[PDB]
Amino acid sequence: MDHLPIFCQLRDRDCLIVGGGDVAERKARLLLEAGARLTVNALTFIPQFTVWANEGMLTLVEGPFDETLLDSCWLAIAATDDDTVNQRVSDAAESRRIFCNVVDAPKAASFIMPSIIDRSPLMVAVSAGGTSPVLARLLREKLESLLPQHLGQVARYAGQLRARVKKQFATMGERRRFWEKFFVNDRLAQSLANADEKAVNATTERLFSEPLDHRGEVVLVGAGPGDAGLLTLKGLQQIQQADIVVYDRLVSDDIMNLVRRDADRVFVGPQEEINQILLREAQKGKRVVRLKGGDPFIFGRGGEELETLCHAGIPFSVVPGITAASGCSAYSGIPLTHRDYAQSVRLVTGTGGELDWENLAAEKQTLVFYMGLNQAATIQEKLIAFGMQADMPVALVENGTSVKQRVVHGVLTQLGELAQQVESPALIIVGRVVALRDKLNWFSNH
Amino acid sequence: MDHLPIFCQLRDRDCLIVGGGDVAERKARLLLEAGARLTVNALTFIPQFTVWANEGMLTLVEGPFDETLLDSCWLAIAATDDDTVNQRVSDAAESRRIFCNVVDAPKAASFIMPSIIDRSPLMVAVSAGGTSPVLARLLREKLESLLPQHLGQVARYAGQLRARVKKQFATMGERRRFWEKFFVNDRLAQSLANADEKAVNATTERLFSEPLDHRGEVVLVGAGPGDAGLLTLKGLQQIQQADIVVYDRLVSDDIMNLVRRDADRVFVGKPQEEINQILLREAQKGKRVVRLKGGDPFIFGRGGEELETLCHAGIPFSVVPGITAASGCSAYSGIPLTHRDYAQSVRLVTGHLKTGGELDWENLAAEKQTLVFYMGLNQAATIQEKLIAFGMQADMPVALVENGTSVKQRVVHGVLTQLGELAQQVESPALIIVGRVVALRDKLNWFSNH
Numbered sequence: 029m030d031h032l033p034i035f036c037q038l039r040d041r042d043c044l045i046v047g048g049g050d051v052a053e054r055k056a057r058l059l060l061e062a063g064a065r066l067t068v069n070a071l072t073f074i075p076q077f078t079v080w081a082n083e084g085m086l087t088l089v090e091g092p093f094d095e096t097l098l099d100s101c102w103l104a105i106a107a108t109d110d111d112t113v114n115q116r117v118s119d120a121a122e123s124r125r126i127f128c129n130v131v132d133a134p135k136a137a138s139f140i141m142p143s144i145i146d147r148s149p150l151m152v153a154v155s156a157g158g159t160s161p162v163l164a165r166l167l168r169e170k171l172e173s174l175l176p177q178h179l180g181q182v183a184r185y186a187g188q189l190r191a192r193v194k195k196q197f198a199t200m201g202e203r204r205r206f207w208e209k210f211f212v213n214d215r216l217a218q219s220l221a222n223a224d225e226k227a228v229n230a231t232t233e234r235l236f237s238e239p240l241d242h243r244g245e246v247v248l249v250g251a252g253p254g255d256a257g258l259l260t261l262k263g264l265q266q267i268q269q270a271d272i273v274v275y276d277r278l279v280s281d282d283i284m285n286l287v288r289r290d291a292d293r294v295f296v297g298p299q300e301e302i303n304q305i306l307l308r309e310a311q312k313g314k315r316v317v318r319l320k321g322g323d324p325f326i327f328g329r330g331g332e333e334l335e336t337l338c339h340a341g342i343p344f345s346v347v348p349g350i351t352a353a354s355g356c357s358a359y360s361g362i363p364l365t366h367r368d369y370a371q372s373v374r375l376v377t378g379t380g381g382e383l384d385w386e387n388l389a390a391e392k393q394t395l396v397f398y399m400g401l402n403q404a405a406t407i408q409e410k411l412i413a414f415g416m417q418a419d420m421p422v423a424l425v426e427n428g429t430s431v432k433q434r435v436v437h438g439v440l441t442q443l444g445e446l447a448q449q450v451e452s453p454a455l456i457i458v459g460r461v462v463a464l465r466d467k468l469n470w471f472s473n474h
Numbered sequence: 475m476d477h478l479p480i481f482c483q484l485r486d487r488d489c490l491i492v493g494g495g496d497v498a499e500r501k502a503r504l505l506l507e508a509g510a511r512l513t514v515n516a517l518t519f520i521p522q523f524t525v526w527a528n529e530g531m532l533t534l535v536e537g538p539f540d541e542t543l544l545d546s547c548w549l550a551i552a553a554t555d556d557d558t559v560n561q562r563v564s565d566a567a568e569s570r571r572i573f574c575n576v577v578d579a580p581k582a583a584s585f586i587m588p589s590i591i592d593r594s595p596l597m598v599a600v601s602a603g604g605t606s607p608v609l610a611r612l613l614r615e616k617l618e619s620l621l622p623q624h625l626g627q628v629a630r631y632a633g634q635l636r637a638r639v640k641k642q643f644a645t646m647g648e649r650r651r652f653w654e655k656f657f658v659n660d661r662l663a664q665s666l667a668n669a670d671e672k673a674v675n676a677t678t679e680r681l682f683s684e685p686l687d688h689r690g691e692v693v694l695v696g697a698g699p700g701d702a703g704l705l706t707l708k709g710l711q712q713i714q715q716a717d718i719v720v721y722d723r724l725v726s727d728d729i730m731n732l733v734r735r736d737a738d739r740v741f742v743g744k745p746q747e748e749i750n751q752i753l754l755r756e757a758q759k760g761k762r763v764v765r766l767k768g769g770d771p772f773i774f775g776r777g778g779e780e781l782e783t784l785c786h787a788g789i790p791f792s793v794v795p796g797i798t799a800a801s802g803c804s805a806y807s808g809i810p811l812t813h814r815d816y817a818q819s820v821r822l823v824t825g826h827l828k829t830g831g832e833l834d835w836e837n838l839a840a841e842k843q844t845l846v847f848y849m850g851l852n853q854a855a856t857i858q859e860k861l862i863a864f865g866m867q868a869d870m871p872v873a874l875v876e877n878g879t880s881v882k883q884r885v886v887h888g889v890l891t892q893l894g895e896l897a898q899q900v901e902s903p904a905l906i907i908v909g910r911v912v913a914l915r916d917k918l919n920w921f922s923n924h
């Protein structure tokens with residue numbers, strides 16, 4: 029260790045930045061975020077500085093560097109393109125024992141600016157002393173994905189609870205467990221973020237009433253079409269705190285490889301049975317994640333699985349996912365809309381009735397068929413027997429977003445035979461947008 | 475942010491600790507190993523202080539607080555159990571603009587001391603600013619079993635190569651591509667952890683020899699509808715490593731806080747073709763450009779128009795899909811887009827009226843579908859009249875979702891004869907959902923009311 033990390037309180041403390049370019053502007057936005065009383069001294073300023081000044085948010089000293097601007101300063105940052113001026117800044121700062129950063133030169137100054145993950149009042153700082161800015165940014169990117177966006181509001185609210193928790197929990201280890209379920213209750217977190225104070229002390233009273241051991245809830249999490257990188261940040265965070273993950277065939281191996289190490293897995297690849305599995309594994313008092321392919325509310329039966337938790341008292345929440353249409357669209361180079369090609373996008377299945385074929389053949393649509401292969405020969409002639417132009421571009425996307433995605437494409441008179449070249453899970457896309465794939469194909473065809 | 479973390483260079487710089495017991499000893503060990511010139515001022519001391527002075531590690535001043543001992547100091551720590559003395563020390567340090575910690579009073583004074591995960595020379599610092607010491611500790615634990623122990627040898631080796639890297643690579647973009655490959659090479663990390671120097675050199679020399687691709691790239695990234703948690707892992711990865719982010723008014727501020735702090739940001743908020751060339755000209759300067767778009771880039775996003783010039787131009791590009799507004803607003807309002815058999819199909823429609831076209835209303839009025847109008851607010855009264863006149867029943871439930879997934883989300887709902895009225899009560903950005911699924915809202919609404 030050759031740097032000591034400290035967390036400085038800068039609110040209304042005099043700080044100085046020397047420089048007025050893009051680099052200084054980024055440091056000024058950091059110091060403004062911390063509430064510093066900011067003076068910025070430069071030969072000239074880019075417009076973002078004069079707008080900041082015209083709003084009373086900092087002070088501008090236009091002109092050469094003047095040492096006396098350090099007279100009552102706590103922090104100094106040299107952010108000019110001129111090594112000579114930066115060296116005069118840092119020398120003037122060192123003889124005044126003002127900690128100083130030189131943006132181009134981390135070893136030439138008395139402090140180094142770390143990568144910051146901001147969950148105020150909780151904060152994480154990562155640095156390797158200027159030996160590795162890229163590693164720092166990589167660790168920041170990781171920490172940013174693991175730390176829920178509203179953890180800071182739980183942190184702030186916990187401090188307003190330290191009393192009421194010791195008064196009802198007289199054991200160290202008992203209180204260690206109350207905080208442990210308190211800080212991962214992200215319903216309470218979102219409840220605080222939304223300023224829905226009826227639902228806060230509702231969740232709060234639940235945290236003191238129910239036993240410590242019981243933290244029961246169900247989260248519907250959309251896994252996306254397969255590529256593990258298409259899981260949402262919130263999805264990952266829920267999967268990392270789950271006591272039990274209920275998943276099915278359509279959730280990819282890559283996503284499951286992200287599940288908590290010490291989490292129980294239930295594989296369910298009849299629909300009524302899945303509903304019961306969710307309920308009383310949540311009535312066991314366990315934090316349950318129901319992982320589903322794509323988006324849980326688009327042909328996922330997510331509606332059916334939650335309504336069982338309704339008259340049952342089990343709290344739930346829903347993390348949306350990248351539906352198959354969106355993923356296959358991006359990864360095949362076929363936009364679902366484009367200029368005037370399509371006034372609407374149609375997400376359609378292929379039980380409970382029969383399809384309206386006149387409707388689907390109407391012009392200016394992008395049609396996206398889910399679960400359609402078993403009717404792909406039927407779809408073909410039924411569309412051209414209801415007016416659809418026989419040359420309509422058509423494409424099929426199998427295992428979209430995955431490392432084994434296959435895209436076969438062509439024209440509506442070939443949909444039947446093209447459909448034999450692909451297996452479930454596949455998507456059928458019909459509309460002029462298909463013809464754009466020749467310009468926008470960037471992913472690998474297998 | 476209520477604190478600014480900084481990593482201070484304490485070598486040969488004067489620091490003062492007031493107080494002489496166990497809490498002071500723990501802070502003094504931290505400052506000795508940071509390399510500081512340490513003076514300790516206390517009425518009473520414990521053993522390790524008096525050996526350290528005999529061992530020449532520090533200077534002891536036995537007696538009451540002496541504020542003149544701060545005259546040359548850069549940092550001060552008040553670590554007595556007497557809160558009156560601690561306050562004198564912090565008042566004396568403040569008047570000299572010396573950052574000061576009062577150990578038992580995190581909310582007072584001017585810097586707090588974080589808990590540290592040490593990888594030498596990598597370091598992660600974490601604090602809740604005293605507001606919740608328990609959360610800090612649980613987070614330390616997760617970060618620990620997340621940062622591999624030998625990350626420090628990789629970081630230490632990077633620092634030894636930095637002068638070689640700055641010489642052989644002229645531009646900063648090629649230096650970045652070297653580091654990105656460098657920090658993800660698992661064989662290099664394991665060869666370092668073995669002091670296997672022939673293996674470290676074989677891989678290092680191959681890494682320097684790799685002809686670096688010099689083109690830039692354009693990445694369309696779907697921000698999702700607003701909640702920063704609905705950004706994808708890959709979308710976060712692209713903006714955490716971008717050079718320039720070109721972003722909309724419909725990208726939320728929370729997502730903009732996820733953008734690489736050292737990337738610059740071009741705003742384009744309400745020209746479709748100045749955007750196309752801003753991307754092109756900024757890309758093949760050699761830099762990674764992220765075009766960050768609200769929702770999903772290929773659903774009413776004109777993402778196709780932005781990419782179509784690049785292929786014939788020789789510019790690589792990719793697309794990261796996002797959570798389209800229909801999905802986000804469905805999940806966050808408790809209105810599933812499909813359910814059992816309420817809906818055979820979902821229709822995402824542009825409620826905008828291109829100055830020449832008109833929607834096909836008989837088509838949209840059909841039964842057993844969920845209609846979702848994008849940018850349809852200012853024509854909501856026309857949508858009401860047209861759907862009704864083409865056969866949709868008057869009691870069809872509708873909902874308008876404004877700022878869906880944000881903490882400012884509002885949802886108003888009713889039947890189709892209210893749609894025109896209901897739209898007067900929200901502003902953009904808002905979605906219109908028409909269909910039987912809207913009635914499920916009272917059974918599936920988890921997010922809030924507002």
Ligand SMILES: Nc1ncnc2c1ncn2[C@@H]1O[C@H](CSCC[C@H](N)C(=O)O)[C@@H](O)[C@H]1O
Pocket residue numbers: 253254278320321322323324325326327328350351352353356397398399400425426427428429452453454455
């Ligand atoms: N990775 C993928 N590639 C292509 N189609 C997929 C897919 N994943 C799911 N699908 C489509 O979705 C159907 C399952 S229905 C479940 C859909 C899921 N809730 C979603 O939002 O995507 C499959 O028959 C297939 O047509």
Ligand SMILES: Nc1ncnc2c1ncn2[C@@H]1O[C@H](CSCC[C@H](N)C(=O)O)[C@@H](O)[C@H]1O
Pocket residue numbers: 699700724768769770771772773774775797798799800803847848849850875876877878879880902903904905906
């Ligand atoms: N957070 C939000 N809540 C409700 N509607 C939203 C929204 N964000 C975008 N929209 C809708 O989207 C329209 C812009 S069109 C761009 C949509 C984006 N490409 C996507 O896939 O979602 C707006 O007029 C509004 O109708």
Ligand SMILES: [Cl-]
Pocket residue numbers: 155156157158159160161162164
């Ligand atoms: Cl670093």
Ligand SMILES: [Cl-]
Pocket residue numbers: 365366367773774775776777
């Ligand atoms: Cl478009």
